[PDB]
Amino acid sequence: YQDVNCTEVNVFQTRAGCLIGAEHVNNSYECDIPIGAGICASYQTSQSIIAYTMSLGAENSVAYSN
Amino acid sequence: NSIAIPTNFTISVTTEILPVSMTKTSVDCTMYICGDSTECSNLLLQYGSFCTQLNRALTGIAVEQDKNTQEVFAQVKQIYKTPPIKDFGGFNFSQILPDPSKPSKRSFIEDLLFNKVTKFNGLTVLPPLLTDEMIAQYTSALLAGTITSGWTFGAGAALQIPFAMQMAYRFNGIGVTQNVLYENQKLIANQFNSAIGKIQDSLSSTASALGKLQDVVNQNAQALNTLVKQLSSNFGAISSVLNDILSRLDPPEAEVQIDRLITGRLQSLQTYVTQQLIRAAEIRASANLAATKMSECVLGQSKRVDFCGKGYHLMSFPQSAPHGVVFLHVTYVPAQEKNFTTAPAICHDGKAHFPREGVFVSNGTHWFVTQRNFYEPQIITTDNTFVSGNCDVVIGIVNNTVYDPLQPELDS
Amino acid sequence: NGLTVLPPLLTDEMIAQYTSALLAGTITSGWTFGAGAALQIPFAMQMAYRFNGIGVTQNVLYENQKLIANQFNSAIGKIQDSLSSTASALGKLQDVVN
Amino acid sequence: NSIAIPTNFTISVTTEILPVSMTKTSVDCTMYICGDSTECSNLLLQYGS
Amino acid sequence: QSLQTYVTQQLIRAAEIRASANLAATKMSECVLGQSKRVDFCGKGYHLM
Ligand SMILES: *[C@@H]1O[C@H](CO)[C@@H](O[C@@H]2O[C@H](CO)[C@@H](O)[C@H](O)[C@H]2NC(C)=O)[C@H](O)[C@H]1NC(C)=O
Ligand SMILES: *[C@@H]1O[C@H](CO)[C@@H](O[C@@H]2O[C@H](CO)[C@@H](O)[C@H](O)[C@H]2NC(C)=O)[C@H](O)[C@H]1NC(C)=O
Ligand SMILES: *[C@@H]1O[C@H](CO)[C@@H](O[C@@H]2O[C@H](CO)[C@@H](O)[C@H](O)[C@H]2NC(C)=O)[C@H](O)[C@H]1NC(C)=O
Ligand SMILES: *[C@@H]1O[C@H](CO)[C@@H](O)[C@H](O)[C@H]1NC(C)=O
């Protein structure tokens, strides 16, 4: 529900509006279905639609030395 | 017979600003034309798909706006980060690297960029998929990669290299021998550090610096304001207000007045959408250019002239900006020059000697061989030149001597 | 009927100063006027530099310098014969004007 | 086991022709849509911008 | 409607010329101010100037 707070309508809050029927996941995975403002959603674990903040990639410190 | 060869150089940093995206607007064609009116909506349906194909066209634009952002910034498979110890050979990158004390880890310069670039009619705005924070993480990764692994992270794995050595390669890539960098490393680092400070002073004081991004915002704002103002037009109707027509006329007459408003308002949306599609194409072309530069400017080193700023390109660093990307292009520019006498070749024993690299120069009494992009005279020897043909062929060939390093070893 | 044609800001005489500047730079200084200030270099040494750019050893220029000068001069001659005889060579510019 | 190495060169000047601008037309639309007519102009104002 | 048709055609035609001005500007920068390693960018052959 774009640009509607969840008080004007499972439920997950996003900057893009009020998501309903998507299971919020604290983990992060690569974008599957783009919801906007970072959040991306997928059909994954027994199966359900999850919604999550997207992974940008595997984090990596380059072993830089002088 | 005269060549000018630079004796000194300056490292300059220039800023190139490109639009990447535009506001992802979305317009409800039914609500815009027939806001909360059943009588008007039923008339609107007589126009078939004219309404919904506009909703489709605007959606298509909104989607490619995320594509544009993704193609420009998400060119790195991993998020790289710099070490806690900034041992980069004297080169200070603290003003382009992320600031950990901020609510959003943006660099000092990025904050400057963000601080310079600035209804109920069915008109809404969708958020971008990649938030400013996510863009900052991508530019951080690209920057950390550029600094600690040079171009290797673009091709494959990020392979660590001392920054000073990375610069040595960057110098060889522009035809300047690597010893120049090391001998002048302190000068180069100081010129670089000063150039960055100049970037901040320019961006912090010249509002027009970000005109390319501010203009995009202004064009889109103007397009929406125009669209909304059109609702006040009568288009031949007794009133621009739909409810005033309905509250005053019976259907057999109200429908006529409403059709006049529908035609005008439907035409207004078509005009708006067409302009957005054309404008979107312009932005897409800019985004494609920005993506090309990211790959061929930040991830690599450009041999393409004036592609990555004026001068000989060394390296570039991306910075994010509202709806766009800003590139700081670090280039090598010859600074001071002298007039030398030259020759295409030198005669020794009747043999014609040509430089393997560099040119022959004369200071008026002695001939030397030196690099074209920096004056560094060397004795002409058989290890600097090669022989082909003889003195009777080359126009402008001059007499000198070519030293043979072997002679004294066998002589003694 | 309300139609007008605004003039260009650069007159075709100013365009011809800019192409003469680009060209007098290109001839006397090679690429160097794009990197910095123009650095003079003799034209027989500028083409020797461009032959190294295509990987041809620069003595292949000096040992053939009259042949190369003559092929450049003859090839510029064919441009006049083409453009004087064949009005359809300008097809893109006449298409835009049409 | 065979390579062909060119023993000569032919310096070729090729013309490439590119559009760079087009005619800066501009139209006073209020003259084109309604020419010297007050009655028509007042009706054209009902179309807003 | 007949003026909007002209202006829409000119806006699309101006994008077609703008992409040709940027290609001419790019060829000016890489071919004239430089020497191009890009194959067939400056006509058939290995580019000299
Ligand atoms: C190349 O130019 C730099 C300046 O851009 C010279 O460095 C300066 O030298 C003067 C003394 O003559 C000092 O007062 C300045 O403070 C120096 N500036 C910097 C940034 O170091 C450098 O010496 C010149 N090199 C050569 C070989 O001529
Ligand atoms: C990189 O440059 C910054 C300046 O932009 C240096 O930070 C300053 O350090 C001095 C002390 O020497 C303080 O008085 C300033 O207030 C600091 N300014 C800022 C903006 O932090 C920084 O130390 C330099 N880093 C290196 C490694 O040379
Ligand atoms: C470069 O040196 C050669 C000798 O090594 C010069 O050759 C002389 O040319 C003159 C004029 O034809 C003859 O009279 C001499 O007998 C030649 N000398 C020898 C030893 O054969 C040549 O002229 C010199 N070129 C320049 C430009 O100084
Ligand atoms: C080279 O000689 C010319 C002679 O006209 C002079 O103007 C120019 O300044 C000289 N260049 C240098 C670097 O001395």
mmCIF file of C-alpha atoms in Angstrom, chain B residues 136-408:
data_model
loop_
_atom_site.group_PDB
_atom_site.id
_atom_site.type_symbol
_atom_site.label_atom_id
_atom_site.label_comp_id
_atom_site.label_asym_id
_atom_site.label_seq_id
_atom_site.Cartn_x
_atom_site.Cartn_y
_atom_site.Cartn_z
ATOM 1 C CA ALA B 136 27.141 5.484 -0.492
ATOM 2 C CA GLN B 137 28.095 1.892 0.261
ATOM 3 C CA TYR B 138 28.652 1.220 -3.420
ATOM 4 C CA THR B 139 30.785 4.284 -3.979
ATOM 5 C CA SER B 140 32.695 3.356 -0.855
ATOM 6 C CA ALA B 141 33.364 -0.125 -2.216
ATOM 7 C CA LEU B 142 34.453 1.216 -5.576
ATOM 8 C CA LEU B 143 36.693 3.739 -3.914
ATOM 9 C CA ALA B 144 38.212 1.286 -1.455
ATOM 10 C CA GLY B 145 38.853 -1.067 -4.342
ATOM 11 C CA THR B 146 40.454 1.668 -6.437
ATOM 12 C CA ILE B 147 42.731 2.708 -3.610
ATOM 13 C CA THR B 148 43.870 -0.668 -2.282
ATOM 14 C CA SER B 149 43.836 -2.897 -5.396
ATOM 15 C CA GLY B 150 43.976 -0.576 -8.401
ATOM 16 C CA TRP B 151 42.203 -2.062 -11.386
ATOM 17 C CA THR B 152 42.530 -5.675 -10.423
ATOM 18 C CA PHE B 153 39.213 -5.699 -8.591
ATOM 19 C CA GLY B 154 37.512 -4.740 -11.838
ATOM 20 C CA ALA B 155 38.948 -7.674 -13.783
ATOM 21 C CA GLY B 156 38.824 -10.308 -11.029
ATOM 22 C CA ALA B 157 39.977 -10.468 -7.428
ATOM 23 C CA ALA B 158 41.009 -7.397 -5.529
ATOM 24 C CA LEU B 159 44.752 -7.775 -5.363
ATOM 25 C CA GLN B 160 46.428 -5.602 -2.812
ATOM 26 C CA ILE B 161 49.178 -3.316 -3.991
ATOM 27 C CA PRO B 162 51.059 -0.484 -2.182
ATOM 28 C CA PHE B 163 49.488 2.749 -3.268
ATOM 29 C CA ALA B 164 52.760 4.259 -4.430
ATOM 30 C CA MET B 165 53.323 1.268 -6.693
ATOM 31 C CA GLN B 166 49.825 1.544 -8.012
ATOM 32 C CA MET B 167 50.621 5.099 -8.991
ATOM 33 C CA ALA B 168 53.791 3.907 -10.688
ATOM 34 C CA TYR B 169 51.689 1.840 -13.017
ATOM 35 C CA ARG B 170 49.348 4.750 -13.570
ATOM 36 C CA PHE B 171 52.380 6.810 -14.615
ATOM 37 C CA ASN B 172 53.764 4.175 -16.972
ATOM 38 C CA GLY B 173 50.299 4.115 -18.524
ATOM 39 C CA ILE B 174 50.671 7.750 -19.583
ATOM 40 C CA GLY B 175 54.165 7.391 -20.979
ATOM 41 C CA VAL B 176 56.069 8.602 -17.917
ATOM 42 C CA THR B 177 58.702 6.286 -16.499
ATOM 43 C CA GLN B 178 57.933 5.037 -12.978
ATOM 44 C CA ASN B 179 61.092 6.466 -11.492
ATOM 45 C CA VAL B 180 59.529 9.884 -11.932
ATOM 46 C CA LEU B 181 56.858 9.018 -9.436
ATOM 47 C CA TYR B 182 59.160 7.663 -6.822
ATOM 48 C CA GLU B 183 61.668 10.458 -7.095
ATOM 49 C CA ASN B 184 58.847 12.990 -6.883
ATOM 50 C CA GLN B 185 56.519 11.012 -4.620
ATOM 51 C CA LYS B 186 56.364 13.719 -1.974
ATOM 52 C CA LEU B 187 55.574 16.364 -4.565
ATOM 53 C CA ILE B 188 52.905 14.259 -6.181
ATOM 54 C CA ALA B 189 51.229 13.394 -2.916
ATOM 55 C CA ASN B 190 51.264 17.061 -1.901
ATOM 56 C CA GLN B 191 49.807 18.202 -5.206
ATOM 57 C CA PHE B 192 47.105 15.574 -4.949
ATOM 58 C CA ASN B 193 46.216 16.526 -1.401
ATOM 59 C CA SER B 194 46.056 20.195 -2.344
ATOM 60 C CA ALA B 195 43.912 19.484 -5.389
ATOM 61 C CA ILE B 196 41.327 17.718 -3.263
ATOM 62 C CA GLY B 197 41.164 20.659 -0.870
ATOM 63 C CA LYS B 198 40.464 22.860 -3.889
ATOM 64 C CA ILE B 199 37.553 20.614 -4.879
ATOM 65 C CA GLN B 200 35.952 21.200 -1.519
ATOM 66 C CA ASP B 201 36.358 24.953 -1.738
ATOM 67 C CA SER B 202 34.761 25.011 -5.166
ATOM 68 C CA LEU B 203 31.826 22.774 -4.290
ATOM 69 C CA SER B 204 31.192 24.589 -1.013
ATOM 70 C CA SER B 205 30.959 28.020 -2.659
ATOM 71 C CA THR B 206 29.795 27.576 -6.253
ATOM 72 C CA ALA B 207 26.117 26.623 -6.339
ATOM 73 C CA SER B 208 26.227 26.349 -10.129
ATOM 74 C CA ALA B 209 28.712 23.497 -9.764
ATOM 75 C CA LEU B 210 25.818 21.048 -9.501
ATOM 76 C CA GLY B 211 23.665 22.691 -12.167
ATOM 77 C CA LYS B 212 23.462 19.467 -14.173
ATOM 78 C CA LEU B 213 21.635 17.720 -11.330
ATOM 79 C CA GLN B 214 19.663 20.723 -10.146
ATOM 80 C CA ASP B 215 18.344 21.186 -13.674
ATOM 81 C CA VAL B 216 16.934 17.674 -13.749
ATOM 82 C CA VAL B 217 15.086 18.320 -10.538
ATOM 83 C CA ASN B 218 13.776 21.606 -11.874
ATOM 84 C CA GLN B 219 12.553 20.150 -15.160
ATOM 85 C CA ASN B 220 10.618 17.430 -13.402
ATOM 86 C CA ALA B 221 9.163 19.840 -10.877
ATOM 87 C CA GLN B 222 8.078 22.109 -13.699
ATOM 88 C CA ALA B 223 6.470 19.218 -15.551
ATOM 89 C CA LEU B 224 4.396 18.256 -12.527
ATOM 90 C CA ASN B 225 3.439 21.805 -11.683
ATOM 91 C CA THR B 226 2.262 22.302 -15.237
ATOM 92 C CA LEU B 227 0.229 19.112 -15.098
ATOM 93 C CA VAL B 228 -1.492 20.143 -11.872
ATOM 94 C CA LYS B 229 -2.237 23.658 -13.052
ATOM 95 C CA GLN B 230 -4.022 22.231 -16.103
ATOM 96 C CA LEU B 231 -6.749 20.966 -13.794
ATOM 97 C CA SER B 232 -7.855 24.585 -13.369
ATOM 98 C CA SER B 233 -8.555 24.959 -17.086
ATOM 99 C CA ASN B 234 -12.069 24.829 -18.491
ATOM 100 C CA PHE B 235 -11.248 23.507 -21.952
ATOM 101 C CA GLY B 236 -14.581 24.938 -23.122
ATOM 102 C CA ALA B 237 -16.543 23.642 -20.142
ATOM 103 C CA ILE B 238 -18.654 25.878 -17.902
ATOM 104 C CA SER B 239 -16.279 25.056 -15.046
ATOM 105 C CA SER B 240 -12.945 23.408 -14.402
ATOM 106 C CA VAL B 241 -14.420 21.908 -11.258
ATOM 107 C CA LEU B 242 -16.011 18.570 -11.954
ATOM 108 C CA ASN B 243 -18.195 18.631 -8.866
ATOM 109 C CA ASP B 244 -19.632 22.010 -9.882
ATOM 110 C CA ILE B 245 -20.741 20.603 -13.195
ATOM 111 C CA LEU B 246 -22.344 17.579 -11.580
ATOM 112 C CA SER B 247 -24.058 19.553 -8.822
ATOM 113 C CA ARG B 248 -25.641 21.887 -11.359
ATOM 114 C CA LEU B 249 -26.516 19.914 -14.474
ATOM 115 C CA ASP B 250 -28.657 16.850 -15.113
ATOM 116 C CA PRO B 251 -26.735 13.955 -16.825
ATOM 117 C CA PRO B 252 -27.911 14.745 -20.446
ATOM 118 C CA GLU B 253 -26.125 18.098 -20.151
ATOM 119 C CA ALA B 254 -23.513 17.310 -17.512
ATOM 120 C CA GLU B 255 -22.011 14.649 -19.741
ATOM 121 C CA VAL B 256 -21.319 17.184 -22.459
ATOM 122 C CA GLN B 257 -19.489 19.497 -20.103
ATOM 123 C CA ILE B 258 -17.598 16.583 -18.621
ATOM 124 C CA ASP B 259 -16.500 15.271 -22.006
ATOM 125 C CA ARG B 260 -14.923 18.663 -22.622
ATOM 126 C CA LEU B 261 -12.916 18.316 -19.407
ATOM 127 C CA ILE B 262 -12.002 14.705 -20.095
ATOM 128 C CA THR B 263 -10.625 15.508 -23.497
ATOM 129 C CA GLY B 264 -8.547 18.364 -22.106
ATOM 130 C CA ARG B 265 -7.282 16.453 -19.081
ATOM 131 C CA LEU B 266 -6.574 13.282 -21.024
ATOM 132 C CA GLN B 267 -4.687 15.351 -23.575
ATOM 133 C CA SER B 268 -2.791 16.993 -20.715
ATOM 134 C CA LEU B 269 -1.618 13.649 -19.383
ATOM 135 C CA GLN B 270 -0.585 12.484 -22.815
ATOM 136 C CA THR B 271 1.508 15.604 -23.207
ATOM 137 C CA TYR B 272 3.086 15.043 -19.791
ATOM 138 C CA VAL B 273 3.860 11.395 -20.382
ATOM 139 C CA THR B 274 5.370 12.046 -23.783
ATOM 140 C CA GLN B 275 7.661 14.664 -22.293
ATOM 141 C CA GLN B 276 8.650 12.284 -19.500
ATOM 142 C CA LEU B 277 9.504 9.542 -21.991
ATOM 143 C CA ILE B 278 11.681 11.861 -24.009
ATOM 144 C CA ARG B 279 13.327 13.282 -20.906
ATOM 145 C CA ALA B 280 13.813 9.773 -19.552
ATOM 146 C CA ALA B 281 15.693 8.872 -22.716
ATOM 147 C CA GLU B 282 18.056 11.772 -22.101
ATOM 148 C CA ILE B 283 18.650 10.621 -18.542
ATOM 149 C CA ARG B 284 19.158 7.063 -19.703
ATOM 150 C CA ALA B 285 21.813 8.186 -22.152
ATOM 151 C CA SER B 286 23.532 10.086 -19.340
ATOM 152 C CA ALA B 287 23.285 7.067 -17.064
ATOM 153 C CA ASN B 288 24.807 4.911 -19.776
ATOM 154 C CA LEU B 289 27.656 7.363 -20.084
ATOM 155 C CA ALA B 290 28.139 7.406 -16.346
ATOM 156 C CA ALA B 291 28.198 3.620 -16.265
ATOM 157 C CA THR B 292 30.726 3.580 -19.080
ATOM 158 C CA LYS B 293 32.945 5.988 -17.205
ATOM 159 C CA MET B 294 32.673 4.060 -14.006
ATOM 160 C CA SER B 295 34.017 0.981 -15.765
ATOM 161 C CA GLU B 296 36.539 2.720 -18.016
ATOM 162 C CA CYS B 297 37.599 5.466 -15.586
ATOM 163 C CA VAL B 298 37.232 4.247 -11.951
ATOM 164 C CA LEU B 299 37.767 0.507 -12.414
ATOM 165 C CA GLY B 300 40.509 0.996 -15.014
ATOM 166 C CA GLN B 301 42.671 3.720 -16.550
ATOM 167 C CA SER B 302 41.561 5.634 -19.609
ATOM 168 C CA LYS B 303 43.646 6.037 -22.728
ATOM 169 C CA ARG B 304 40.703 7.869 -24.246
ATOM 170 C CA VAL B 305 41.415 11.578 -24.543
ATOM 171 C CA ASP B 306 39.312 13.939 -22.458
ATOM 172 C CA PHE B 307 37.072 11.027 -21.573
ATOM 173 C CA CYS B 308 38.113 11.337 -17.890
ATOM 174 C CA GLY B 309 39.017 15.072 -17.714
ATOM 175 C CA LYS B 310 41.608 17.136 -19.540
ATOM 176 C CA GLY B 311 45.167 15.878 -19.177
ATOM 177 C CA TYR B 312 46.606 12.406 -19.055
ATOM 178 C CA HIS B 313 44.280 10.269 -17.006
ATOM 179 C CA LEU B 314 45.697 8.510 -13.987
ATOM 180 C CA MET B 315 42.774 7.493 -11.780
ATOM 181 C CA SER B 316 39.261 8.501 -10.786
ATOM 182 C CA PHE B 317 37.099 8.387 -7.701
ATOM 183 C CA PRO B 318 33.263 8.266 -7.704
ATOM 184 C CA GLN B 319 31.166 10.253 -5.253
ATOM 185 C CA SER B 320 27.397 10.012 -4.973
ATOM 186 C CA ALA B 321 25.046 12.942 -5.457
ATOM 187 C CA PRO B 322 21.243 13.385 -5.497
ATOM 188 C CA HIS B 323 20.018 11.573 -8.589
ATOM 189 C CA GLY B 324 23.514 11.378 -10.019
ATOM 190 C CA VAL B 325 27.195 10.619 -9.781
ATOM 191 C CA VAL B 326 30.184 12.865 -9.445
ATOM 192 C CA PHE B 327 33.600 11.835 -10.632
ATOM 193 C CA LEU B 328 36.825 13.247 -9.350
ATOM 194 C CA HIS B 329 39.288 12.747 -12.154
ATOM 195 C CA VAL B 330 42.943 12.765 -11.256
ATOM 196 C CA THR B 331 45.080 13.713 -14.209
ATOM 197 C CA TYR B 332 48.702 14.379 -15.051
ATOM 198 C CA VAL B 333 49.274 17.715 -16.687
ATOM 199 C CA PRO B 334 52.681 18.928 -18.016
ATOM 200 C CA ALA B 335 53.485 22.144 -16.148
ATOM 201 C CA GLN B 336 56.729 23.704 -17.307
ATOM 202 C CA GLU B 337 58.605 23.339 -20.580
ATOM 203 C CA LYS B 338 61.856 24.109 -22.322
ATOM 204 C CA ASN B 339 62.816 24.615 -26.002
ATOM 205 C CA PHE B 340 65.261 21.874 -27.151
ATOM 206 C CA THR B 341 66.844 21.331 -30.517
ATOM 207 C CA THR B 342 65.948 17.958 -31.933
ATOM 208 C CA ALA B 343 66.705 15.374 -34.585
ATOM 209 C CA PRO B 344 64.883 12.257 -35.880
ATOM 210 C CA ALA B 345 68.059 10.200 -35.761
ATOM 211 C CA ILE B 346 71.750 10.245 -34.945
ATOM 212 C CA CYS B 347 74.728 9.100 -37.073
ATOM 213 C CA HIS B 348 77.575 7.171 -35.411
ATOM 214 C CA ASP B 349 79.701 5.082 -37.798
ATOM 215 C CA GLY B 350 77.477 5.813 -40.782
ATOM 216 C CA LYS B 351 74.734 3.847 -39.070
ATOM 217 C CA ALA B 352 71.458 5.580 -38.259
ATOM 218 C CA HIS B 353 70.448 5.324 -34.606
ATOM 219 C CA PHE B 354 66.855 5.953 -33.509
ATOM 220 C CA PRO B 355 65.544 6.118 -29.891
ATOM 221 C CA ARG B 356 63.853 2.992 -28.615
ATOM 222 C CA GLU B 357 61.790 5.302 -26.458
ATOM 223 C CA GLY B 358 61.898 9.052 -26.182
ATOM 224 C CA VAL B 359 63.477 11.633 -28.435
ATOM 225 C CA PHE B 360 66.866 13.071 -29.138
ATOM 226 C CA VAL B 361 67.364 16.519 -27.712
ATOM 227 C CA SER B 362 70.105 19.069 -27.627
ATOM 228 C CA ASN B 363 70.799 21.758 -25.022
ATOM 229 C CA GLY B 364 73.011 23.551 -27.634
ATOM 230 C CA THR B 365 76.222 21.640 -26.961
ATOM 231 C CA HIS B 366 75.322 18.031 -26.151
ATOM 232 C CA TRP B 367 72.840 15.483 -27.432
ATOM 233 C CA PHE B 368 70.770 13.434 -25.032
ATOM 234 C CA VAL B 369 67.928 11.009 -25.295
ATOM 235 C CA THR B 370 64.907 11.677 -23.056
ATOM 236 C CA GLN B 371 61.213 10.727 -22.460
ATOM 237 C CA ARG B 372 58.647 12.783 -24.473
ATOM 238 C CA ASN B 373 56.344 13.601 -21.482
ATOM 239 C CA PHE B 374 59.146 14.580 -19.021
ATOM 240 C CA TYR B 375 62.645 16.024 -19.387
ATOM 241 C CA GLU B 376 65.189 13.605 -18.065
ATOM 242 C CA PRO B 377 68.269 13.664 -20.299
ATOM 243 C CA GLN B 378 70.370 10.557 -20.668
ATOM 244 C CA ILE B 379 73.590 9.833 -22.481
ATOM 245 C CA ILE B 380 72.883 8.345 -25.855
ATOM 246 C CA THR B 381 74.026 4.753 -25.825
ATOM 247 C CA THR B 382 73.467 1.552 -27.734
ATOM 248 C CA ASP B 383 71.057 0.508 -24.978
ATOM 249 C CA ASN B 384 68.871 3.574 -25.592
ATOM 250 C CA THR B 385 68.808 3.482 -29.376
ATOM 251 C CA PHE B 386 68.488 0.974 -32.188
ATOM 252 C CA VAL B 387 70.016 0.860 -35.636
ATOM 253 C CA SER B 388 68.224 0.762 -38.925
ATOM 254 C CA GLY B 389 69.584 1.796 -42.289
ATOM 255 C CA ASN B 390 72.207 4.489 -42.660
ATOM 256 C CA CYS B 391 72.895 8.260 -42.743
ATOM 257 C CA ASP B 392 72.001 8.764 -46.461
ATOM 258 C CA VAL B 393 68.307 8.093 -45.956
ATOM 259 C CA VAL B 394 66.948 10.064 -42.984
ATOM 260 C CA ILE B 395 66.053 13.697 -43.498
ATOM 261 C CA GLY B 396 67.442 15.869 -40.735
ATOM 262 C CA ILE B 397 69.768 13.222 -39.322
ATOM 263 C CA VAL B 398 72.586 14.726 -37.272
ATOM 264 C CA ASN B 399 76.137 13.671 -36.308
ATOM 265 C CA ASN B 400 76.957 12.651 -32.707
ATOM 266 C CA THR B 401 78.488 9.726 -30.924
ATOM 267 C CA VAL B 402 76.762 6.741 -29.444
ATOM 268 C CA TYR B 403 78.321 5.287 -26.349
ATOM 269 C CA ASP B 404 78.854 1.542 -26.155
ATOM 270 C CA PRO B 405 78.855 0.369 -22.466
ATOM 271 C CA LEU B 406 80.764 -2.750 -23.483
ATOM 272 C CA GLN B 407 83.809 -0.942 -24.803
ATOM 273 C CA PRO B 408 85.364 0.148 -21.422
#
